[PDB]
Design a protein around this ligand. Structure first.
Ligand code: GNP
Ligand code: K85
Ligand code: CL
Ligand code: CL
Ligand code: CL
Ligand code: MG
Lengths: 123, 205, 1015
């Protein structure tokens, strides 16, 4: 499973989307627990998210210091950001993600923790 | 790792392709683009008995787009028969799909699925769904839209095919992801993403 | 690519190439497979591809290639058989028969190419449907003769006969005309004596071979239709119930045969037959006990192990036992010597009922309901089953599924959490279980109390304590409410509550408390009779629910709200009167503390709380007192409203917090209006005029935002929040008007300001800013007072008709909600205020007719059904007018448009769900001409001779229409169809049969025109 060597810094239910630039539309990639995981040997913090029931990975990438969380025009409980290397489906690939939460409170908490993890990764 | 041919059949518009797509990519396709003949998709699940691969033959339900029809069923090792609980005609046609299927595939595990249970005005009442009993089919209420029971058909089939009643889906290994940054990168592509509204903003998540 | 060669028919077919393409399709992957699939589909669909069939069958080295060759032939046989030259029909028959003969003779091919042989057999059967018996009278005799020559041939002949029986009796209804199905059923019936004789001979001299299995599979099909004498006057029941139950190879199919035998049409005054029916059951159960498993066996364990075919066998045994006993158990109930058989059979069912398999449990539970419902009524029967019923009580109580009211559930980490979604698929199961347990409790209330009370004992002492055990028990206790006497219930409920309160004290941690909380709330909500008798306890329950409204466990909190309203719906009278030894009706106390009580609830939970208070207040029938209670209840939302109305009118952009406050105020009014209905009027009057002013102001903000930011503005949180305000205002007005009892005040006071505020705003917004809820509100307005506001109804049509039509008439998908609400509005206007359509200008009326026909081309049932109903209602509306110029012009302009449009959706195969209502509309239209209810000629002066009747012209028009739309039909087919259809236009059932026959004939060539004489 490859998560026993990591501390869970933060966990929250979320729906993750990926932007399809060709279709010009957002498409759902998964709904489940989104976790911030800090490796005990490298101190590096990643996002790992798995779908309910199938437990398949729908996000797996470092919370890079250069990423920035931006609002979506349709929502006060979501963030959109560009990710250069996600390995959820195998080979490293660039995506524009959107992650939406149950409330604005949850979205704001996520940004707060997202940015904490970014500072952790720079150290 | 060995794979199993799964054939998916049922009336046009019952949600066969949408169901498979949900499993392949996690998306929910709102549009109805009718399948032409068959679309074949590999689908892997991770279990406590190792990976299981389904080769999903998602067939056309519209008669005018039926293609090879029962020709698709040759050497199928399992099947899903789909109907729409908001459309009584689609349940009425279940015995026709079953007939055509078992004539080619005489002894395979088959799940009957009543899709679209998210829709409030249900037309095929729970009490009415009995066709599976005398034919030894498993039955599930499902919704590809809300994901209600969406994993159940595949979990049941995997149990029958691998021959292990206590087979469970398990969490796939999560490899360490890489570090990256191309110095000359300009994506105004983010601004298009930001200004395209996310779908279903009234949903719980 | 090289693969496309097979599509060039000018050249000779490269069989090697074809086999490569087929193999690439079935055994390949990715792009190669996809390309191969397209090529093969194109090949199959070539209308001369069948001429290659024999060549492929002769030379191919690929079984799948030959399967595809047979599918091509099947397509030809089923659709174009009679288009063929006669020598081509003979050639095709000959090489299909020969291929089958050939494949059966070679043992290796017979063994390993079963798919191809089965496909060949079905193809032969398609030819028989066309050719037999009239052009093939010796098929059955020669099949029988051929059977003795070889075991392989005999076996295959059973497959052919099975397929023929299926096609003729089980699947003919949709695929053949009534006349053709009767012809083939009669033909099979006439030669069945010989078929059965062969079948019986094989079964007599064979044990458990593949030939025997095949013969039994064919027997299963015959049992659907054959006369009972073939089963009861031969020795076949002995063979099925003894010999064929012993070998597992034949056991599966024999059990299903015996299940179908239990459904035969059979004399019920015949002692000899009754004994045969008893004997086969006796034999069958004896073979089970001696060859499979004893009655004591753990079938739960066996099913769970899922060895070989055990699950399917246990399922089929369940079906056999339930089917037989539901029909025949009375045969076993009087004779002392049959008592052990009766009970052993039921004991097997008891054991089957312990299996963990939902769908199987439902099957057995259906049987138990049949049993206990009979024991509830039938003298002197229940005592026979007392031991079975006692075991059944235990099974049901231990397998109770979660009621919809229980909102907590255990997650994968062992934590008790609020459910993410409703368990929609267990609602019916719970109801079925409760039905059975209720009957079981009436049958023995003492046994039931004892089982429950002692199970509860073992939870307290800790011996069987578990969430699962306390849960199923609590759910069972709640589900039997109503079965006991008030006095026994009193003592029972008291004991239960005592014990559950003990558990709550003893079991610590929030997961334990959440579970026991859920269970006590469920139980107390299920016993309102008790609550009504015990005020002090009722008061204490409600006050405790109020404490739970402060719980941080979201599941408990939410269930507390649902339980409060559930209790209030039943006990409201006790909240409205002043109880002995209280200083005020409890409703006063509830209202006075409403701010404290609901402080931690989410808005929607708050609205539910207010809705419950509305239920109580509507019990007060003194109007002065009722209105004061209503006033007191709405104090908080009215004070918030008043300050917002002073702000808004002081100076209009509403920030997001103010928009949320407003929406929740209106939602609170909606909640209270829903429960109070007609009694809500004084509160509506307090806010009405300012509310419509707010609607206008919010509308300007939305419009302003779309103007400054573009259509994307409508996706933003601010604009979505503004539209929520408009939607809830419309919902409140709709909700009130739908329940109003003073319709004069609705018209004099409510309607004019409403139309003024909503109609022009709808009309003059861009499509994406129009609320479909406006149409919904207008439907209720027309429905309730439409007859009193003829000019208002005209104003509604003027404002929404043409602009909404233009939104929805470019495709079937855009603006789904507007689409649905649009046709609901037209339907009610057409029913209630038809004059509104009479006032339309001719061009707009034409659009209305267009709109209706557009509706019945939808596959969306909401739209389609209303479209067909509107059309039917419109015809009735025109007819009522009698012989007047508008009716005459209507028919001249539109009668044939309706006839042809209805025919189009009848015959196009994409609107099968609408068949019944399409047929009804068509029959009405045709009957109008055949009762001479159209006063003017439907034709032009030039078309046809002066004085020609409308009946003669209608036939002429339809024959022409059908002739051009279906050119493969003969003139006689069309003339015969119309003759029949026209003559049957007063008899819907026959009329529909004739339509179904026509739908069969258009799928093929050379349909027999005499079929339309069926009667
Ligand atoms: N509400 C709801 N809609 C669904 C669900 N599943 C599918 N749909 C919708 O139903 C329509 C048909 O879906 P689709 O998968 O194309 O059906 P299909 O059975 O593959 N049709 P075909 O046999 O012609 O290829 C789509 O608009 C889709 O969004 C569901 O669970 N709920
Ligand atoms: C146990 C449940 C509990 O307290 O859990 C919370 C979350 C801490 N418990 C103790 N007392 C009750 C109780 C008592 C009542 O008195 C008449 C009434 C109820 C009610 F459910 F019916 F409201 C509950 N529950
Ligand atoms: Cl084959
Ligand atoms: Cl009451
Ligand atoms: Cl003719
Ligand atoms: Mg499809």
């Amino acid at each position: 499973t490859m998560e026993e060597d990591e501390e869970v810094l933060y966990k929250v239910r979320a729906k993750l989307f990926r932007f399809d630039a060709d279709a010009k539309e957002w498409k759902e990639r998964g709904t489940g627990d989104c976790k911030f995981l800090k490796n005990k040997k490298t101190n590096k913090v990643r996002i790992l998210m798995r779908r309910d029931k199938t437990l398949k990975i729908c996000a797996n990438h470092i919370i890079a210091p250069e990423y920035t969380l931006k609002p979506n025009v349709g929502s006060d409980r979501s963030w959109v950001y560009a990710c250069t290397a996600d390995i959820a489906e195998g080979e490293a690939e660039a995506f524009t993600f959107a992650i939406r939460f149950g409330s604005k409170e949850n979205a704001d908490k996520f940004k707060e923790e997202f940015e904490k993890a970014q500072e952790i990764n720079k150290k | 790792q060995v794979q199993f041919k799964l054939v998916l059949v049922g009336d046009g518009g019952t949600g066969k392709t949408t169901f498979v797509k949900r499993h392949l990519t996690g998306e929910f396709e709102k549009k109805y683009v009718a399948t032409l003949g068959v679309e074949v998709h590999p689908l892997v699940f991770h279990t406590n008995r190792g990976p299981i691969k389904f080769n999903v033959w998602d067939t056309a339900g519209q008669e005018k787009f039926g293609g090879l029809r029962d020709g698709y069923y040759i050497q199928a090792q399992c099947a899903i028969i789909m109907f729409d609980v908001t459309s009584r005609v689609t349940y009425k046609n279940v015995p026709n799909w079953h007939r055509d299927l078992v004539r080619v595939c005489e002894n395979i595990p088959i799940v009957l699925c009543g899709n679209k249970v998210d829709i409030k005005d249900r037309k095929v009442k729970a009490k009415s769904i009995v066709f599976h009993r005398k034919k030894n089919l498993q039955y599930y209420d499902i919704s590809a839209k809300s994901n209600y029971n969406f994993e159940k058909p595949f979990l049941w089939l995997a149990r029958k095919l691998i021959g292990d009643p206590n087979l469970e889906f398990v969490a796939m290994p999560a490899l360490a992801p890489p570090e990256v940054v191309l110095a000359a990168q300009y994506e105004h592509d983010l601004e298009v993403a930001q200004t395209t509204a996310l779908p279903d903003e009234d949903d719980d998540l | 690519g090289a693969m496309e060669g097979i599509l060039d028919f000018s050249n000779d077919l490269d069989i090697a190439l074809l086999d490569q393409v087929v193999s690439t399709f079935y055994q390949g992957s990715g792009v190669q497979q996809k390309q191969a699939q397209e090529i093969l589909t194109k090949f199959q669909d070539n209308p001369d591809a069948w001429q290659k069939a024999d060549q492929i069958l002769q030379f191919s080295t690929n079984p799948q290639s030959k399967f595809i060759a047979l599918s091509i032939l099947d397509k030809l046989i089923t659709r174009k058989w009679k288009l063929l030259p006669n020598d081509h029909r003979i050639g095709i028959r000959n090489f299909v028969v020969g291929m089958i003969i050939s494949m059966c003779q070679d043992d290796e091919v017979f063994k390993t190419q079963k798919n191809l042989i089965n496909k060949s057999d079905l193809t032969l059967v398609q030819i028989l449907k066309q050719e037999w018996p009239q052009n093939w009278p010796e098929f059955i005799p020669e099949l029988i003769g051929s059977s003795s020559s070889s075991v392989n041939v005999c076996e295959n002949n059973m497959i052919v006969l099975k397929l023929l029986s299926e096609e003729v009796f089980d699947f003919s209804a949709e695929q053949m005309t009534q006349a053709k199905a009767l012809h083939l059923k009669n033909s099979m019936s006439k030669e069945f004596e010989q078929i059965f004789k062969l079948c019986f001979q094989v079964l007599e001299q064979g044990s458990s071979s593949s030939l025997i299995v095949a013969t039994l599979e064919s027997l299963l099909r015959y049992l659907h239709w054959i006369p009972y004498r073939y089963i009861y006057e031969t020795n076949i029941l002995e063979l099925l119930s003894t010999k064929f139950m012993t070998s597992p190879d034949t056991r599966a199919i024999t059990l299903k045969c015996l299940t179908e035998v239990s459904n035969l049409k059979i004399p019920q005054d015949n002692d000899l037959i009754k004994r045969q029916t008893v004997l086969f059951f006796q034999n069958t159960l004896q073979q089970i006990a001696t060859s499979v498993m004893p009655v004591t066996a753990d079938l739960k364990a066996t099913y769970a192990n899922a060895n070989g075919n055990d699950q399917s066998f246990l399922q089929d045994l369940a079906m056999f036992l339930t089917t037989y006993l539901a029909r025949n158990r009375a045969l076993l109930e009087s004779d002392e010597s049959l008592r052990e058989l009766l009970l052993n059979a039921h004991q097997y069912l008891i054991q089957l009922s312990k299996i963990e398999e939902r769908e199987l449990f439902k099957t057995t539970l259906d049987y138990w309901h049949n049993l206990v419902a009979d024991l509830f009524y039938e003298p002197l029967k229940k005592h026979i089953y007392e031991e079975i019923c006692s075991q059944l009580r235990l099974v049901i109580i231990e397998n109770m599924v979660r009621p919809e009211e229980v909102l907590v559930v255990e997650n994968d980490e062992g934590e008790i959490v609020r459910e993410f979604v409703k368990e929609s698929d267990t609602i019916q199961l719970y109801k079925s279980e409760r039905e059975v347990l209720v009957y079981l409790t009436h049958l023995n209330v003492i046994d039931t109390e004892e089982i429950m009370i002692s199970k509860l004992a073992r939870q307290i002492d800790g011996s069987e304590w578990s969430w699962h055990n306390i849960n199923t028990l609590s759910w069972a206790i709640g589900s039997i409410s109503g079965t006991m006497s008030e006095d026994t219930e009193k003592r029972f409920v008291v004991t239960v509550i005592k014990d559950l309160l003990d558990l709550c004290v003893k079991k610590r941690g929030k997961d334990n408390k959440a579970v026991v909380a859920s269970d006590i709330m469920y139980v107390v909500g299920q016993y309102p009779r008790f609550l009504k008798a015990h005020w002090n306890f009722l008061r204490t329950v409600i006050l405790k629910l109020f404490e739970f409204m402060h719980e941080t466990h979201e599941g408990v909190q939410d269930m507390a709200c649902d339980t409060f309203i559930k209790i209030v719906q039943k006990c409201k009278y006790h909240f409205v009167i002043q109880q002995p030894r209280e200083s005020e009706p409890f409703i006063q106390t509830i209202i006075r503390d409403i701010q404290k009580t609901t402080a931690d609830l989410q808005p929607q939970q708050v609205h539910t709380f207010y809705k419950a208070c509305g239920i109580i207040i509507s019990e007060e029938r003194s109007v002065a007192e009722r209105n004061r209670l209503l006033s007191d209840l709405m104090q908080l939302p009215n004070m918030a409203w008043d300050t917002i109305v002073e702000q808004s009118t002081a100076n209009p952009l509403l920030d997001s917090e103010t928009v949320k406050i407003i929406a929740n105020i209106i939602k609170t009014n909606v909640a209270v209006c829903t429960s109070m209905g007609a009694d809500f009027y004084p509160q509506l009057g307090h806010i009405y005029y300012n509310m419509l002013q707010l609607y206008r102001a919010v509308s300007s903000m939305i419009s302003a935002q779309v103007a400054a930011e573009g259509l994307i503005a409508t996706k933003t949180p601010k604009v979505r929040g503004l539209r929520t305000i408009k939607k809830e205002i419309l919902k409140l007005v709709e909700t009130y008007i739908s329940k109003a009892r003073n319709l004069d005040d609705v018209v004099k006071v409510l309607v004019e300001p409403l139309l003024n505020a909503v109609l022009e705003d709808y009309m003059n917004n861009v499509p994406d800013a129009r609320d479909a809820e406006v149409l919904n509100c207008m439907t209720t307005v027309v429905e309730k007072v439409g007859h009193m506001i003829p000019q208002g109804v005209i104003l509604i049509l003027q404002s929404v008709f043409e602009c909404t039509l233009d939104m929805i008439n470019k495709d079937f998908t855009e603006y789904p909600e507007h689409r649905v609400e649009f046709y609901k509005l037209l339907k009610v206007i057409n029913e209630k205020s038809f004059a509104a359509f009479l006032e339309l200008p001719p061009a707009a009326f034409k659009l209305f007719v267009d709109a209706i026909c557009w509706a019945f081309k939808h596959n969306n049932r909401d739209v389609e059904v209303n479209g067909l109903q509107i059309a039917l209602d419109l015809v009735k509306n025109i007819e009522r007018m009698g012989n007047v110029p508008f009716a005459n012009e209507f028919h001249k302009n539109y009668f044939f448009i309706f006839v042809s449009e209805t025919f189009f959706v009848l015959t196009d195969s994409d609107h099968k769900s609408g068949f019944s209502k399409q047929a009804l509309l068509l029959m009405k239209l045709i009957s109008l001409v055949y009762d001479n209810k159209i006063s003017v000629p439907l034709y032009q002066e030039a078309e046809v001779p002066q004085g020609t009747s409308n009946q003669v012209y209608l036939s002429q028009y339809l024959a022409n229409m059908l002739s051009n739309a279906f050119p493969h039909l003969t003139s006689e087919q069309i003339a015969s169809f119309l003759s029949a259809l026209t003559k049957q236009c007063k008899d819907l059932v026959v009329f529909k049969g004739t339509l179904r026959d026509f739908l069969v004939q258009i799928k093929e060539v050379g349909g027999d025109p005499t079929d339309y004489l069926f009667a």
